[PDB]
């Protein structure tokens, strides 16, 4: 931190204590955030932000450099061939993917399957020239369970059928039970803490994304506050995904809010499930057929 202009030893200490440890957070911070640190003037605040942006080369980029940025995105396999295809490879890091679906469509299954697949290194697709092994080494998952449907048994099961050690999945997945939107949001904001503590958080699951908000803001006479809070929650999620190059998944029970990728899942015949990609920034809408068995997502 003392590398930054306007940052002395005493200032560095305040910064690390206020949770500002890495350059990107400072580079992307506002003067307000930094001035609420006490002992930090605005001039010093503005100087370090400018410095952080420069040390992180956050300026205009063109030509080939535009390709390199996009190459830092790695993807997580879903164990479904058709789904990975419709996804253009698999679930993208640096983005928020949503699986909306009717009751029992498999939203929660996909979340569990994703935590398991994170532990199979061959399920993380990436350009080894833009993403080093170390960056995806000892990957960990954060599971914000708002429904109370996290099932370690399902994790163990999905894991064995994948030839992955179940306990290892459990040992590398942080679960937080949220009972309302307040807890749901705070847990997400605290993910930074797990990372500063040395945890290579690469997957974040929010199941469910909307249940709490709908339950608390029932009265459609204050839907504004609702949209606001949630919007702020999505901002936090998108930033988290970009800055920590990790995949963010969210579920939504349906039978408006921000989401980079949008799916609507429905039940087919028995095992069958039909997921429809109806919105994304660079891919055409498409359908993916797969099934949910004792092994998890397959085909
Ligand atoms: N151990 C298992 N073996 C085989 N199939 C399973 C197993 N566990 C769950 N399933 C399937 O997963 C379905 C439930 O998927 P689920 O992820 O709970 O849907 P959902 O969309 O999250 N439901 P909801 O949260 O209520 O809206 C079941 O009804 C089973 O068909
Ligand atoms: K300095
Ligand atoms: K079922
Ligand atoms: K979108
Ligand atoms: Mg993003
Ligand atoms: Mg569910």
Curated annotation (Swiss-Prot):
SMART domains found in the cross-reference section: AAA (SM00382), HhH1 (SM00278)
Single Gene Ontology BP annotation: DNA recombination
Molecular function terms from GO: ATP binding; ATP hydrolysis activity; ATP-dependent DNA damage sensor activity; damaged DNA binding; identical protein binding
Keywords assigned by UniProt, alphabetized: ATP-binding, DNA damage, DNA recombination, DNA-binding, Nucleotide-binding
Binding site for ATP: 101-108
Main function: Involved in DNA repair and in homologous recombination. Binds and assemble on single-stranded DNA to form a nucleoprotein filament. Hydrolyzes ATP in a ssDNA-dependent manner and promotes DNA strand exchange between homologous DNA molecules.
Xref: NCBIfam families: PRK04301.1, recomb_radA
Family affiliation: Belongs to the eukaryotic RecA-like protein family.
Protein name: DNA repair and recombination protein RadA
Species name: Methanococcus voltae
């Amino acid at each position: 931190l003392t590398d930054l202009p306007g940052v002395g030893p005493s200032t560095a200490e305040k910064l690390v204590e206020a949770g500002y440890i890495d350059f990107m957070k400072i580079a992307t911070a506002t003067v307000g955030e930094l001035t609420d640190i006490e002992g930090i003037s605005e001039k010093a605040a503005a100087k370090m932000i400018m410095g952080a942006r420069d040390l992180c080369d956050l300026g205009f980029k063109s030509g080939i450099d535009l390709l390199k940025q996009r190459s830092t995105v790695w993807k997580l396999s879903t164990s479904s061939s058709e789904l990975d295809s419709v996804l253009g490879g698999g679930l993208e890091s640096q983005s928020v993917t949503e699986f909306a679906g009717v009751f029992g469509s498999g939203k929660t299954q996909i979340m569990h399957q994703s935590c398991v697949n994170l532990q199979n290194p061959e399920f993380l697709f990436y350009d080894e020239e833009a993403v080093s092994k170390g960056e995806v080494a000892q990957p960990k998952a954060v599971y914000i369970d708002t429904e109370g449907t996290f099932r370690p048994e399902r994790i163990m099961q999905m894991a064995e059928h994948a030839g992955i050690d179940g306990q290892t999945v459990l040992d590398n997945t942080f679960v937080a039970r949220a009972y309302n939107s307040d807890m749901q949001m705070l847990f997400a904001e605290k993910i930074e803490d797990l990372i500063q503590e040395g945890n290579n958080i690469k997957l974040v699951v929010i199941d469910s994304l909307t249940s709490t908000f709908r339950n608390e803001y029932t009265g459609r006479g204050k839907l504004a506050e609702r949209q606001q809070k949630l919007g702020r929650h999505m901002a936090t999620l998108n930033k988290l995904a970009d800055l920590f190059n990790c995949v963010v998944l969210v579920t939504n029970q349906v039978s408006g809010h921000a989401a980079t990728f949008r799916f609507f899942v429905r039940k087919g015949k028995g095992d069958k499930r039909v997921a429809k990609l109806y919105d994304s920034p660079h891919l055409p809408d498409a359908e993916a057929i797969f099934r949910i068995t004792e092994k998890g997502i397959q085909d």
